[PDB]
Enzyme design. Structure first.
Site, short mmCIF file in Angstrom:
data_model
loop_
_atom_site.label_atom_id
_atom_site.label_comp_id
_atom_site.label_asym_id
_atom_site.label_seq_id
_atom_site.Cartn_x
_atom_site.Cartn_y
_atom_site.Cartn_z
N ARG A 54 0.71 -1.02 -0.03
CA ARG A 54 -0.01 0.09 -0.16
C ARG A 54 0.86 1.30 -0.10
O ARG A 54 1.65 1.40 0.88
CB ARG A 54 -0.91 0.01 1.13
CG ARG A 54 -2.12 1.42 1.04
CD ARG A 54 -3.08 0.99 2.33
NE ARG A 54 -3.68 -0.33 2.25
CZ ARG A 54 -3.48 -1.12 3.61
NH1 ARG A 54 -2.70 -0.49 4.44
NH2 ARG A 54 -4.21 -2.30 3.52
N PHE A 59 1.20 10.50 1.69
CA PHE A 59 1.00 9.88 2.85
C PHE A 59 2.06 9.00 3.54
O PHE A 59 2.94 9.52 4.43
CB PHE A 59 -0.21 9.53 2.85
CG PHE A 59 -0.88 8.93 4.47
CD1 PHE A 59 -0.04 9.13 5.40
CD2 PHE A 59 -1.73 8.04 4.18
CE1 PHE A 59 -0.65 8.44 6.69
CE2 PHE A 59 -2.53 7.58 5.25
CZ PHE A 59 -1.78 7.79 6.57
N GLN A 62 3.71 1.49 2.76
CA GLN A 62 3.52 0.47 3.64
C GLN A 62 3.95 -1.03 3.20
O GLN A 62 3.34 -1.26 1.85
CB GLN A 62 2.19 0.36 4.29
CG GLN A 62 1.77 -0.73 5.40
CD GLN A 62 0.37 -0.63 5.82
OE1 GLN A 62 -0.27 0.43 5.57
NE2 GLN A 62 -0.17 -1.86 6.65
N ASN A 101 -0.11 -1.49 12.84
CA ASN A 101 -0.79 -2.29 13.88
C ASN A 101 -2.23 -2.48 13.48
O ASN A 101 -2.67 -2.02 12.35
CB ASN A 101 -0.43 -1.94 15.09
CG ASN A 101 -1.06 -0.32 15.29
OD1 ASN A 101 -2.25 -0.18 15.38
ND2 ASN A 101 -0.29 0.57 15.91
N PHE A 112 5.55 1.28 8.01
CA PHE A 112 5.52 2.13 6.84
C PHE A 112 6.38 3.24 6.95
O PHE A 112 7.24 3.46 8.10
CB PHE A 112 3.80 2.84 6.99
CG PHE A 112 3.56 3.57 8.44
CD1 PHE A 112 2.93 2.85 9.39
CD2 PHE A 112 3.64 4.87 8.31
CE1 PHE A 112 2.71 3.38 10.53
CE2 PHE A 112 3.20 5.49 9.37
CZ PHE A 112 2.93 4.98 10.47
N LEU A 121 -0.70 10.67 13.59
CA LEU A 121 -0.52 9.29 13.82
C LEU A 121 0.22 9.30 15.06
O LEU A 121 0.52 8.10 15.38
CB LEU A 121 0.29 8.59 12.44
CG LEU A 121 -0.44 8.55 11.18
CD1 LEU A 121 0.47 7.83 10.40
CD2 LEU A 121 -1.93 7.79 11.55
N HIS A 125 1.08 4.88 16.46
CA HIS A 125 2.12 4.11 15.76
C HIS A 125 3.10 4.34 16.34
O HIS A 125 3.65 5.53 16.68
CB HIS A 125 2.00 4.16 14.18
CG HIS A 125 0.43 3.88 13.49
ND1 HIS A 125 0.44 2.58 13.39
CD2 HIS A 125 -0.38 4.68 13.35
CE1 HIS A 125 -0.88 2.57 12.58
NE2 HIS A 125 -1.23 3.95 12.75
#
Ligand SMILES: CO[C@@H]1[C@@H](C)[C@@H](OC)/C=C/C=C/CCOC(=O)[C@@H]2CCCN(N2)C(=O)[C@H](Cc2cccc(O)c2)NC(=O)[C@H](C(C)C)NC(=O)[C@@H]1C
Length: 163
Positions: A54, A59, A62, A101, A112, A121, A125
């Site tokens: 992904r 952004f 991942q 996660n 990521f 975030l 994370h």
């Protein structure tokens, strides 16, 4: 003394470049060790051969699913999931390396790389490293992502290890 690992990124098999990371073992030793050991293959499984499933331009990128290769899998060196070690470090900008996660204390192997500041975030994370060299390779990776994250080419870790 903070360890350094490298990914050699390929695009549909064609070498693109190397990305190297500093792992903040001084601040998140357990989380750093997991990522370090998965990068060398010294536990008998790991990142080599797996893809970035992904990629969302602007952004993050991942990957880390080497068990199912469909974005749902992966595992840590400690068993299936380990704890959020701490949230000392923040998603301050592009190059930040952070654990994916599925809720509190569910770290496996998925991770990521931020391509921007993603302060939303923070606390969600665990940040445990940062791109050292090859940020231009991560940017090149972005072009194969999409706003929904699906990738238009197979973006893989052809090789990885510790430097
Ligand atoms: C297929 O994944 C399943 C769902 C998350 C998936 O459904 C299509 C949802 C995707 C939502 C995407 C919007 C973009 O955000 C992301 O991609 C985030 C960014 C930070 C890292 N990250 N993924 C994650 O950590 C995400 C969850 C997430 C999503 C959005 C924000 C966030 O803080 C965390 N987990 C996962 O990807 C884990 C794996 C690590 C097993 N997956 C699961 O628990 C599920 C099985």
């Amino acid at each position: 003394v903070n360890p350094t690992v490298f990914f050699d990124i390929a695009v549909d098999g064609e070498p693109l470049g190397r990305v190297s990371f500093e792992l903040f073992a001084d601040k998140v030793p357990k989380t750093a060790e997991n990522f370090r050991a998965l990068s060398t293959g010294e536990k008998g499984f790991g990142y080599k051969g797996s893809c970035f499933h992904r990629i969302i331009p602007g952004f993050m990128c991942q990957g880390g699913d080497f068990t199912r290769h469909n974005g749902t899998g992966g595992k840590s060196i400690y068993g299936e999931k380990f704890e959020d070690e701490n949230f000392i470090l923040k998603h301050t900008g592009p190059g930040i390396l952070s654990m994916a996660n599925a809720g509190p204390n569910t770290n496996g192997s998925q991770f990521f790389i931020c391509t921007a500041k993603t302060e939303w975030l923070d606390g969600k994370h665990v940040v445990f490293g940062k791109v050292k060299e090859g940020m231009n390779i991560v940017e090149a990776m972005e072009r194969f992502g999409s706003r929904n994250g699906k990738t238009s080419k197979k973006i893989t870790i052809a090789d990885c290890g510790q430097l």
